Design a protein around this ligand. Structure first.
Ligand SMILES: [Ca+2]
Ligand SMILES: [Ca+2]
Ligand SMILES: [Ca+2]
Ligand SMILES: [Ca+2]
Lengths: 98, 98
């Protein structure tokens, strides 16, 4: 359900989970990102880093892929990954694979 | 002055990225964690979260889909999901939790 006490890495994985949760509460359902929580998060929280708040919709489609449009409790998480690499990885992903 | 703060999510991806990196560099290739390199994270800094510094092999196989014995940045990054999940999830089936 949630966290009793934490070491360093445990704190720093929490801080992003609480950010997730506090936003993700908004429309429906805290446990899933909804699309006026997600776009709010990129608009508000990410904007400098995810310098494409605009075409969130593409990232959403890429994230969701069951396409239930609940950005699920690890679909969503990927995003933090993309920012995590982005700092290192300006644009240079490409990939294409079925 | 300089020493300008970044957005909350920038701060938090950096703090985990730097931690990652100081392990990523331990052995060959300052991006990939090899087996020992990987085990060092859990062994050193992750006692409560994934209380299993035994079957790190299981995690490794679950993580390194290609089984190259390098968790590249993005492969390693998987763990952070399982962490960010566990802190909420942990054993939401039996325990309980806390
Ligand atoms: Ca929601
Ligand atoms: Ca979904
Ligand atoms: Ca290495
Ligand atoms: Ca690999």
């Amino acid at each position: 359900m949630a966290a009793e006490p934490l070491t360093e890495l445990e704190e720093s994985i929490e801080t992003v989970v609480t950010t997730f949760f506090t936003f993700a509460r908004q429309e429906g359902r805290k446990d899933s990102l909804s699309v006026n929580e997600f776009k709010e998060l990129v608009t508000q929280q990410l904007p400098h880093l995810l310098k494409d708040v605009g075409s969130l919709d593409e990232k959403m489609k890429s994230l969701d892929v069951n396409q239930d449009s609940e950005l699920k409790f690890n679909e969503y998480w990927r995003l933090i990954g993309e920012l995590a690499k982005e700092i290192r990885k300006k644009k240079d992903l490409k990939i294409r694979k079925k």
